[PDB]
Design a protein around this motif. Structure first.
Motif, PDB file in Angstrom:
ATOM      1  N   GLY A   1      33.830  56.907  44.418  1.00 24.44           N
ATOM      2  CA  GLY A   1      34.723  57.039  43.282  1.00 24.44           C
ATOM      3  C   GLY A   1      35.080  55.689  42.692  1.00 24.44           C
ATOM      4  O   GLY A   1      34.378  54.707  42.932  1.00 24.44           O
ATOM      5  N   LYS A   2      36.168  55.645  41.921  1.00 21.11           N
ATOM      6  CA  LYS A   2      36.654  54.400  41.323  1.00 21.11           C
ATOM      7  C   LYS A   2      37.239  53.458  42.361  1.00 21.11           C
ATOM      8  O   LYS A   2      38.007  53.873  43.228  1.00 21.11           O
ATOM      9  N   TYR A   3      36.875  52.186  42.265  1.00 25.13           N
ATOM     10  CA  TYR A   3      37.523  51.155  43.059  1.00 25.13           C
ATOM     11  C   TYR A   3      37.946  50.012  42.151  1.00 25.13           C
ATOM     12  O   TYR A   3      37.116  49.245  41.662  1.00 25.13           O
ATOM     13  N   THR A   4      39.248  49.922  41.915  1.00 27.24           N
ATOM     14  CA  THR A   4      39.786  48.907  41.032  1.00 27.24           C
ATOM     15  C   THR A   4      40.286  47.703  41.832  1.00 27.24           C
ATOM     16  O   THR A   4      41.049  47.846  42.789  1.00 27.24           O
ATOM     17  N   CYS A   5      39.824  46.520  41.441  1.00 21.77           N
ATOM     18  CA  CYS A   5      40.263  45.275  42.056  1.00 21.77           C
ATOM     19  C   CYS A   5      41.261  44.582  41.137  1.00 21.77           C
ATOM     20  O   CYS A   5      40.990  44.391  39.951  1.00 21.77           O
ATOM     21  N   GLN A   6      42.414  44.206  41.679  1.00 24.40           N
ATOM     22  CA  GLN A   6      43.454  43.604  40.862  1.00 24.40           C
ATOM     23  C   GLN A   6      43.920  42.259  41.390  1.00 24.40           C
ATOM     24  O   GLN A   6      44.834  42.174  42.210  1.00 24.40           O
TER      25      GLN A   6
ATOM     26  N   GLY B   1      49.541  35.548  35.187  1.00 23.50           N
ATOM     27  CA  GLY B   1      49.105  36.850  34.712  1.00 23.50           C
ATOM     28  C   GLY B   1      48.362  37.666  35.754  1.00 23.50           C
ATOM     29  O   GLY B   1      48.233  37.236  36.905  1.00 23.50           O
ATOM     30  N   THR B   2      47.885  38.846  35.350  1.00 27.80           N
ATOM     31  CA  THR B   2      47.075  39.721  36.209  1.00 27.80           C
ATOM     32  C   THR B   2      45.904  40.329  35.444  1.00 27.80           C
ATOM     33  O   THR B   2      46.012  40.616  34.255  1.00 27.80           O
ATOM     34  N   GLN B   3      44.789  40.536  36.131  1.00 35.21           N
ATOM     35  CA  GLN B   3      43.639  41.201  35.527  1.00 35.21           C
ATOM     36  C   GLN B   3      42.959  42.108  36.557  1.00 35.21           C
ATOM     37  O   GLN B   3      43.119  41.920  37.766  1.00 35.21           O
ATOM     38  N   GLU B   4      42.220  43.105  36.078  1.00 37.84           N
ATOM     39  CA  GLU B   4      41.496  44.012  36.966  1.00 37.84           C
ATOM     40  C   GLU B   4      40.156  44.452  36.382  1.00 37.84           C
ATOM     41  O   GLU B   4      39.885  44.285  35.192  1.00 37.84           O
ATOM     42  N   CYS B   5      39.323  45.017  37.244  1.00 37.21           N
ATOM     43  CA  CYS B   5      38.063  45.607  36.832  1.00 37.21           C
ATOM     44  C   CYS B   5      37.705  46.629  37.886  1.00 37.21           C
ATOM     45  O   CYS B   5      37.996  46.428  39.064  1.00 37.21           O
ATOM     46  N   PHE B   6      37.084  47.728  37.478  1.00 40.17           N
ATOM     47  CA  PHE B   6      36.657  48.726  38.450  1.00 40.17           C
ATOM     48  C   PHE B   6      35.147  48.737  38.646  1.00 40.17           C
ATOM     49  O   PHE B   6      34.400  48.054  37.944  1.00 40.17           O
ATOM     50  N   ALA B   7      34.714  49.535  39.611  1.00 40.47           N
ATOM     51  CA  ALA B   7      33.305  49.766  39.860  1.00 40.47           C
ATOM     52  C   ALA B   7      33.208  51.029  40.699  1.00 40.47           C
ATOM     53  O   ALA B   7      33.993  51.223  41.628  1.00 40.47           O
ATOM     54  N   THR B   8      32.258  51.894  40.366  1.00 39.43           N
ATOM     55  CA  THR B   8      32.136  53.169  41.061  1.00 39.43           C
ATOM     56  C   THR B   8      31.107  53.133  42.177  1.00 39.43           C
ATOM     57  O   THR B   8      29.928  52.861  41.950  1.00 39.43           O
ATOM     58  N   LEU B   9      31.569  53.403  43.389  1.00 36.36           N
ATOM     59  CA  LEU B   9      30.663  53.618  44.500  1.00 36.36           C
ATOM     60  C   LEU B   9      30.239  55.088  44.522  1.00 36.36           C
ATOM     61  O   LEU B   9      31.076  55.992  44.522  1.00 36.36           O
ATOM     62  N   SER B  10      28.933  55.320  44.520  1.00 36.46           N
ATOM     63  CA  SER B  10      28.398  56.669  44.561  1.00 36.46           C
ATOM     64  C   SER B  10      27.565  56.861  45.825  1.00 36.46           C
ATOM     65  O   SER B  10      26.466  56.319  45.946  1.00 36.46           O
ATOM     66  N   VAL B  11      28.101  57.629  46.768  1.00 37.08           N
ATOM     67  CA  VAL B  11      27.408  57.896  48.025  1.00 37.08           C
ATOM     68  C   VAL B  11      26.431  59.068  47.897  1.00 37.08           C
ATOM     69  O   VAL B  11      26.836  60.229  47.826  1.00 37.08           O
TER      70      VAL B  11
END
Length: 569
Positions: A546-551, A557-567
């Motif tokens: 699913g979604k994994y957001t890194c923050q 300030g703060t920033q984030e980006c996600f990436a989907t792991l698909s098993v």
């Protein structure tokens, strides 16, 4: 050759004057080694004090050193050589002379003094009985209570005990024996009794002080009237001014009234009468207290750990003395406080100065009867010195940043802050503050313009310094490599990774469908080291998809980006 001696010239009759040495003689030739003996026939002469007998050349001579009645008679000279002998006799007889009177030298004139003894005198030779008569004018002189004459051993005198105007004139002195006559005359003159002046009491040289008066006091004796006059420094002293001269009964007195500087020197008194002169000399020594020719400069300023040369010019009376007073306390002679007095120069050479050597300074020269001083004010300061170098400030926008420097030295100081060659003044943006040992500035509500280097100059009367503090901007967190997708076989390993940038106080946060992710080691290991974050999975599996957001998240300030792991199953 070869003969018994013989006479070339025999002894001859001689007439000798009494009291004077005669010399008899004869010449004798003949065979060498001739010896002469002299006699009074009935006696052989032996040599002695009275007899002086010689035989140079062929002449034999008896020398009677002084003739007397005993020497009259018959003499015999007898020459002898180994062959034979000759002898010649003759007679010595007295010159029985008889002579008229005669002066040996003219009756000398006499020039003596009235009321005093005088005496004429002359030698007169001639046969006794000699008569002598003295005449003044044509009158014969006789001995009375005042007139005295003698005549003995051929010397005639004429003495007058107290001379008198009357005695002036020509005196004749005529001798006479029954053989004839002699005469000489001479003149008497008389002068008045004058005692040339001399100072029986000399005046004393004195050392007087400015203002007060003193006196020179001398006494003269000699035949009145004695004219007295004075003369200071070889210029006749005349009445009216600072000098007053009095004189009563031969006691002269020069008084200097108000002793000025120009009254010092040689005072000489001059006496004079008909028959002579004299003078004596004193000396007025005026004592001048020390006076400052070249005084010290009022104040001065010097850096700590240095030197300076205070120098004074003193004059006045001989035997002067310099004593320096640091705050009234005597100043020793060290490598710290040097001193030397040479011909009016009072030097104080101070080495290795510091804050300890501040306050006042007085130069004190004294003498016979004076002592003035010249005082100065020293001040040894410390140069400015920025102790600490304010660690650079890294801030965020909108924030106020307080920048400060540590200061030490000698206040007050001249503090200035500049940025990029522009002088910053305490306005809206800047708030500069300057206290005792404290300097700083407030930059309010920081913008990009403020990003840069700040330069601080402090300085006082001696030195100067530059302080430096910088304002760096604190960088937000950014993704150099945003998370990328992954898909693994069930049971296989996965590593979600991103590379992070920005201000080092960073904090990463791992999420999954809003759910706050932990890190149980069934497979999950959350990290961050050397600018890279990893959500590791030692063993993947269902649900881990699913979604994994890194923050990433610091202060800027703060920033984030996600990436989907698909098993994939």
């Amino acid at each position: 050759a070869m003969e018994p001696p013989y006479f070339i010239e025999p002894l001859e009759h001689v007439e000798a004057a009494i009291g004077e040495p005669i010399t008899l003689q004869c010449k004798v030739d003949g065979t060498p080694e001739i010896r002469i003996a002299w006699y009074k026939e009935h006696t052989k002469l032996r040599s002695a004090p009275a007899y002086k007998m010689q035989f140079k050349n062929n002449v034999a001579s008896l020398v009677i050193n002084k003739v007397d009645h005993s020497d009259v008679g018959e003499y015999t000279c007898k020459a002898e050589n180994s062959v034979g002998a000759v002898a010649s006799s003759a007679v010595l007889v007295i010159k029985e002379r008889k002579l008229p009177p005669s002066f040996a030298r003219k009756l000398k004139d006499v020039h003596e003094t009235l009321g005093f003894p005088v005496a004429f005198e002359c030698r007169i030779n001639g046969s006794e009985p000699l008569q002598v008569s003295w005449y003044k004018d044509g009158e014969l002189l006789k001995d009375d209570a005042n007139l005295q004459t003698s005549f003995i051993h051929n010397v005639a005198t004429l003495q007058i005990l107290q001379t008198d105007q009357s005695h002036v004139g020509q005196y004749n002195c005529s001798a006479s024996n029954p053989l004839g006559t002699a005469s000489s005359s001479a003149k008497l003159t008389l002068s008045e009794h004058e005692v040339p002046p001399f100072f029986d009491l000399k005046p004393v040289s004195v050392d007087l002080a400015l203002g007060e008066s003193g006196t020179f006091k001398c006494h003269v004796t000699g035949t009145a009237p004695i004219k007295i006059t004075w003369a200071k420094d070889n210029r006749e002293i005349r009445p009216g001014g600072n000098y007053k001269m009095t004189l009563v009964e031969n006691t002269a007195t020069l008084t200097v009234l108000k002793v000025t500087k120009g009254d010092a020197g040689q005072y000489t008194c001059y006496a004079s009468n008909v028959a002579g002169k004299d003078s004596c000399s004193a000396q007025l020594g005026v004592q001048e207290p020390p006076r400052f020719i070249k005084k010290l400069e009022p104040s001065r300023i010097v850096k700590q750990d240095e030197h300076t040369r205070y120098e004074c010019k003193i004059g006045g009376s001989p035997e002067i003395k310099v004593l320096w007073y640091k705050d009234e306390t005597e100043i020793q002679e060290s490598s710290k406080f040097r001193m030397s007095f040479v011909e009016s120069v009072a030097v104080l050479e101070m080495y290795n100065l510091s804050v300890e050597d501040s306050g006042d300074y007085t130069c004190e020269a004294h003498n016979a009867a004076g002592s003035a001083s010249s005082s100065t004010s020293l001040k040894v300061k410390e140069p400015p010195v920025f102790r600490k170098k304010p660690h650079p400030v890294e801030t965020l926008k909108g924030a106020d940043v307080h920048l400060e420097c540590e200061l030490q030295g000698t206040p007050p100081f001249q503090v200035s802050w500049h940025k990029d060659k522009r002088e910053l003044r305490s306005g809206k943006k800047y708030k500069i503050m300057s206290e005792n040992f404290l300097t700083s500035i407030h930059i309010l509500n920081v913008d990009s313009a403020d990003i840069g280097e700040y330069q601080c100059k402090a300085s006082n009367d001696v030195g100067s310094d530059t302080c430096v503090g910088s304002i760096t901007l604190k960088a937000p967190p950014r993704f150099v490599k945003k998370l990328s997708d992954i898909s693994t076989v069930v049971g296989e390993e996965v590593q979600l990774q991103a590379t992070i940038e920005g201000a080092e106080p960073i904090s990463v946060a791992w999420f999954k469908d809003k759910g706050e992710i932990v890190r149980e080691s069934d497979n999950i290991w959350i990290s961050y080291s050397e600018n890279i974050a990893t959500l590791q999975f030692s063993r993947a599996e269902p649900a881990n998809a699913g979604k994994y957001t890194c923050q990433i998240k610091n202060e800027a300030g703060t920033q984030e980006c996600f990436a989907t792991l698909s098993v994939l199953e």
